[PDB]
Design a protein around this ligand. Sequence first.
Ligand code: OZR
Ligand code: CL
Ligand code: MG
Length: 213
Amino acid sequence: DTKEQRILRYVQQNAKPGDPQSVLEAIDTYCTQKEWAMNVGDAKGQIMDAVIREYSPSLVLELGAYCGYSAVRMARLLQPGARLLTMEINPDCAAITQQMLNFAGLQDKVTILNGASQDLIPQLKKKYDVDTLDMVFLDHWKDRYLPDTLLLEKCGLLRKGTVLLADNVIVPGTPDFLAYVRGSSSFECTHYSSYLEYMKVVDGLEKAIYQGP
Ligand SMILES: O=C(NC/C=C/[C@H]1OC[C@H](O)[C@@H]1O)c1cc([N+](=O)[O-])cc(O)c1O
Ligand SMILES: [Cl-]
Ligand SMILES: [Mg+2]
């Protein structure tokens, strides 16, 4: 029995099936009151929600599903016909994420990719019928944010106006990524100050909008 399985079970026992908001609320309750876990959380989540609503993306890539909290958060705001692809390196987590989405009634909008980002990114266009991405959410290994951004760019997955939105740029931090995007004329960056999930520690999201080569 793992922490992640306990979260899934709590959602199954307490949330309303087919109600994404209820699923988010049960996850946030469990992680607030019983066991901390690395979900984006409600405070950063509201900022995510605002960004998604602003850009109305048709095709979103998530790096790092975990338990599917952000997958649920994002997919519930997607317009009909829009798609979320989410990459998860751990097969236990990838299974839990599928179950979370199923419960929420979002399975039709979301496609889970099991594998390492660096291995899956070059297969997106051909295997998943992708031209360019409208939005990318980065929440996987923090040392992978920069090299996976360079890989997205190499593989032709970014277009002018693709929105990159990165969690944990302060805590635990992604200092190479943040230096890079903020220094590059290919990115226009905005910082959204917030708090680390379930805590009083300052963290933030960075939005980096790709400008072209
Ligand atoms: O390592 C973090 N995320 C990367 C984890 C990536 C993989 O580990 C478990 C699962 O397989 C996931 O895809 C992290 C860590 C903290 N933290 O405070 O440690 C807060 C966060 O929001 C995080 O995303
Ligand atoms: Cl999450
Ligand atoms: Mg995170």
